[PDB]
Amino acid sequence: MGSITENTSWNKEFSAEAVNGVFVLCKSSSKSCATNDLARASKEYLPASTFKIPNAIIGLETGVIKNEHQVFKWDGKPRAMKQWERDLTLRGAIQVSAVPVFQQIAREVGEVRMQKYLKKFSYGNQNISGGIDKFWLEGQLRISAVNQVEFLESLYLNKLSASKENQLIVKEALVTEAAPEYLVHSKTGFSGVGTESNPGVAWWVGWVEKETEVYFFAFNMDIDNESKLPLRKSIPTKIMESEGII
Amino acid sequence: MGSITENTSWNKEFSAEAVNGVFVLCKSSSKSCATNDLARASKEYLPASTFKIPNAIIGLETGVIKNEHQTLRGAIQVSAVPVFQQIAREVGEVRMQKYLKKFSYGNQNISGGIDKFWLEGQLRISAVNQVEFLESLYLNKLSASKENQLIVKEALVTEAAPEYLVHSKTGFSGVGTESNPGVAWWVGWVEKETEVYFFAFNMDIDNESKLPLRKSIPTKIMESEGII
Numbered sequence: 001m002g003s004i005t006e007n008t009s010w011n012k013e014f015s016a017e018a019v020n021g022v023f024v025l026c027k028s029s030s031k032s033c034a035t036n037d038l039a040r041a042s043k044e045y046l047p048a049s050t051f052k053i054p055n056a057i058i059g060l061e062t063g064v065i066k067n068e069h070q071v072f073k074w075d076g077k078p079r080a081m082k083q084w085e086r087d088l089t090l091r092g093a094i095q096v097s098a099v100p101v102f103q104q105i106a107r108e109v110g111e112v113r114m115q116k117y118l119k120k121f122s123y124g125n126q127n128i129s130g131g132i133d134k135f136w137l138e139g140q141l142r143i144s145a146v147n148q149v150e151f152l153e154s155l156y157l158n159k160l161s162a163s164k165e166n167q168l169i170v171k172e173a174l175v176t177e178a179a180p181e182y183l184v185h186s187k188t189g190f191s192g193v194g195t196e197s198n199p200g201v202a203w204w205v206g207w208v209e210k211e212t213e214v215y216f217f218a219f220n221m222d223i224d225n226e227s228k229l230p231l232r233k234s235i236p237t238k239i240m241e242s243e244g245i246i
Numbered sequence: 247m248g249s250i251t252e253n254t255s256w257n258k259e260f261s262a263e264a265v266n267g268v269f270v271l272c273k274s275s276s277k278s279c280a281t282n283d284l285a286r287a288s289k290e291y292l293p294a295s296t297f298k299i300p301n302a303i304i305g306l307e308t309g310v311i312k313n314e315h316q317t318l319r320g321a322i323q324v325s326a327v328p329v330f331q332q333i334a335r336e337v338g339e340v341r342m343q344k345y346l347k348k349f350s351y352g353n354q355n356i357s358g359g360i361d362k363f364w365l366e367g368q369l370r371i372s373a374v375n376q377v378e379f380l381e382s383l384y385l386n387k388l389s390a391s392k393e394n395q396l397i398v399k400e401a402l403v404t405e406a407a408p409e410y411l412v413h414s415k416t417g418f419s420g421v422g423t424e425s426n427p428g429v430a431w432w433v434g435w436v437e438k439e440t441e442v443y444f445f446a447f448n449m450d451i452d453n454e455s456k457l458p459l460r461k462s463i464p465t466k467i468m469e470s471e472g473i474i
């Protein structure tokens with residue numbers, strides 16, 4: 001990505017909560033990014049829900065998802081989470097990480113096309129093995145904070161191998177905070193509580209569009225208890241708040 | 247839209263603030279609308295700042311505007327009036343006039359200065375015409391590229407929530423004259439779950455202190471309706 005510099009100051013936010021994780025921030029572009037840990041910044045973790053971003057783009061590119069206004073009909077059958085038991089729009093499905101909607105999209109896309117696009121997007125290790133509808137939920141797919149940032153930058157610039165149209169559609173679906181001075185696009189992820197001495201990973205990736213400047217970020221941390229999720233946003237938020245970004 | 251129904255009960259929020267104005271709320275699924283006053287819903291007023299929406303679309307379509315990053319959202323949000331007066335100048339009266347006709351925007355009267363006709367000129371548009379215009383935008387049905395309509399749609403985002411996204415733009419023609427108060431606007435649409443709500447609000451105004459009401463009143467109505 002060119003270069004990545006360490007920023008020891010941000011570490012306090014991690015120690016305070018006794019959290020092991022990383023934060024990567026890049027101003028203007030991925031040419032110059034700062035982080036609190038050079039090693040972890042490029043370490044690859046299961047993307048979990050953050051994979052819904054590329055999954056949505058591929059869905060539109062392949063025609064599997066007709067257009068930005070397609071409704072994902074609930075068939076009445078029981079779903080893992082109550083917030084998924086109802087019809088959903090693309091933005092709706094992304095915001096609540098509606099697994100079954102994205103699993104149906106993945107199956108329709110198929111393994112050959114999914115592989116092809118992850119290669120075009122240089123998405124992490126590009127490993128989709130272990131089942132077309134769950135590789136990003138419990139498979140071998142892995143991606144780093146640095147790679148996430150590069151991927152989001154391409155999206156922001158409409159440089160991914162997809163129509164500008166489809167890229168714009170997904171970007172609007174990722175808006176999570178709007179303010180007169182800045183628009184925030186982001187996506188959270190959580191692999192789970194993990195196994196015996198093998199914690200899961202929690203994510204928060206996205207970018208902030210200001211008046212004349214854009215900031216790209218990616219955050220991930222280890223986690224063994226779901227009651228820790230709040231940290232996934234507070235730490236990065238507290239940091240970006242410190243930089244005057246948000 | 248498909249139909250409109252008058253509901254005088256909303257006048258509640260209007261009397262409370264002692265304000266003369268109208269609110270138009272349309273449900274996309276049922277294609278039906280509701281308003282506290284049918285007559286004023288069709289009354290056409292100066293679009294003011296709300297004109298930036300069609301303005302921005304025309305600017306991109308005519309190439310006068312680089313791209314969403316040129317940023318456009320900054321141009322529509324972080325004031326800078328001269329910025330859009332620039333775009334209008336470059337667009338020209340011939341093209342500008344052509345797009346408003348394609349858009350079926352108000353009375354399509356752009357006389358009195360190609361760079362201020364929407365601020366003090368003869369251009370007039372009703373609340374109903376605003377929601378119809380915004381619906382065409384939402385459906386990418388305006389005579390412009392989908393890409394440009396999408397760019398403008400995101401630039402107009404003013405509130406994001408897990409369950410909904412609000413797109414909107416305010417308007418203000420000034421305190422006006424004596425028995426001729428100015429007009430304040432708040433138009434936009436809300437994407438709430440799988441439903442879409444288009445809205446248009448305007449009120450007579452002679453004091454900038456009451457300016458906050460253009461958002462305040464419509465917001466209370468959409469809350470009581472469980473929109474936002």
Ligand SMILES: *C(=O)[C@](NC(=O)[C@H](C(=O)O)c1ccc(O)cc1)(OC)[C@@H]1N=C(C(=O)O)C(=C)CO1
Pocket residue numbers: 047048049050096097098099136137138188189190191192193202203229
């Ligand atoms: C996305 O990250 C999320 N969870 C998972 O993808 C994850 C998995 O299967 O890998 C999971 C699934 C079910 C569980 O009971 C626990 C973990 O949903 C697709 C979602 N994202 C969250 C987040 O904000 O990070 C959540 C708190 C809940 O899961």
Ligand SMILES: *C(=O)[C@](NC(=O)[C@H](C(=O)O)c1ccc(O)cc1)(OC)[C@@H]1N=C(C(=O)O)C(=C)CO1
Pocket residue numbers: 294295296297298321322324325326327328329330331365416417418454
């Ligand atoms: C419209 O947005 C604009 N500005 C205002 O109306 C602004 C406001 O209400 O927020 C305001 C209010 C009271 C004041 O005394 C001064 C300003 O007015 C038309 C203006 N118009 C633009 C345009 O392109 O039409 C702009 C780019 C900037 O804002």
